[PDB]
Design a binder for these strands. Sequence first.
RNA 1: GGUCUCUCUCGU
RNA 2: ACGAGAGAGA
Length: 462
Amino acid sequence: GEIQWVKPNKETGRLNINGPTRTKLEPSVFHDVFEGNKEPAVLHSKDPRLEVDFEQALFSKYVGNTLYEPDEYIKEAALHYANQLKQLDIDTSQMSMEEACYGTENLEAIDLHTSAGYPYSALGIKKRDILDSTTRDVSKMKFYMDKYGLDLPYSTYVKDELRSIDKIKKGKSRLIEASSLNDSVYLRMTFGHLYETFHANPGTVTGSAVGCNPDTFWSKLPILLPGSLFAFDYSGYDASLSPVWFRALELVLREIGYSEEAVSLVEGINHTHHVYRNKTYCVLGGMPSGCSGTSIFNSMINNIIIRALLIKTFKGIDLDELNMVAYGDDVLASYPFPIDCLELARTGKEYGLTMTPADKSPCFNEVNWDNATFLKRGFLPDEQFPFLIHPTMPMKEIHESIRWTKDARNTQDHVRSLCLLAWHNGKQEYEKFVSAIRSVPVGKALAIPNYENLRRNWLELF
RNA sequence: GGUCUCUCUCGU
RNA sequence: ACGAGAGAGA
Ligand SMILES: Nc1ccn([C@@H]2O[C@H](COP(=O)(O)OP(=O)(O)OP(=O)(O)O)[C@@H](O)[C@H]2O)c(=O)n1
Ligand SMILES: [Mg+2]
Ligand SMILES: [Mg+2]
Ligand SMILES: [Zn+2]
């Protein structure tokens, strides 16, 4: 991805979009009980913690575009992936606006607790003023689609979240592109059935982990992914995507049966307009992260990416022996022979992609179940039943979360959630985490889950 | 102050 | 089942 132009809002006639500049994150009562190295991300340009210009740091992620049209590796890759998807028999028919707005069994309803985007957000119009859970009224929605139409600009806000100190010093906060409700609706109508299929089928046919539940999914993955593991990270995936991957996405969609009107919508996320503050800017390439389908399309593109890299980097690849599961840019994959990722990475560079050793190691090492991670979790066989696999969120990560809150009112819920993540690491580590939580007055006021209950509730899932 | 997923909690 | 809230992940 690459910023094509920037114009003031006077010149484009776009309403300014300003977001908050103060973090809602405050240190929790456990801040000094656990060690951690993250803080609230830089939200404002005059943040004393800065060491670089903010805005230039924020937008440096648009590293530019290499390929615009599919070469022959990418084509072959798209087709292999699309043929794989066909057995799922995705219903390419348009989803009704009522189902799109208000949801189904395999698609959650549009979030009514979340902004409505351009232009409503500047007009004081919330999602709740157009949609109603109980009514399932679609009438005002239709009315607004007509008034403001589609392809409305994304609103750019900075994400309020904890970031490692290095990224705070270097102003590398993340940006989210707040969709217009109109585009969300329309994209859900076009692909809601695809969404439903993906959510209902995490695994190696979708090649996706969206919809997965780590407690139960981590036990399938060594069966789903037989042979030699490989994995890596992308640096700035969404923005690093060149238009070719959107061309590629299109070919997959066509091949599984989408109408050209349906397929045409891809170009409207490949080429987007964004309002950040008082300006309008144009982005060519790059997933507008915040659009409907972000996760699924990233996952799909990722599947295309992996195949294309493999048959370009190596001789005699059999794509049919490829297994992979993607969650956006997060990948875990296997093949009957070990795959050298340093070379995949060299090839990816030519495509504008930046690929780094699993977990930000210094170098590309062997990936095995003992050191693999996916969705930040490790893989740890249960000592009693070794075919049942724990997803292990590292305690260091759990320590970062607990040291802050955005509202201490919900402390109880927060610590409980962490415990649900922590116990997988084992009895000894878990009680250590609990005893440290207990070491402080608020901590002694909290209901903390009993370990063996957690374990036995885990086992009962199977 | 986005798209989504998973899980938990509290209600009726 | 329907409502509200939270955490986590991409
Ligand atoms: N809160 C998030 C996090 C991630 N993503 C999507 O998932 C991809 C991968 O996210 P991640 O690997 O966690 O971050 P990067 O964007 O690769 O890294 P950076 O922090 O450098 O931007 C992104 O490209 C983005 O499209 C997202 O939509 N929302
Ligand atoms: Mg990445
Ligand atoms: Mg990973
Ligand atoms: Zn443009």
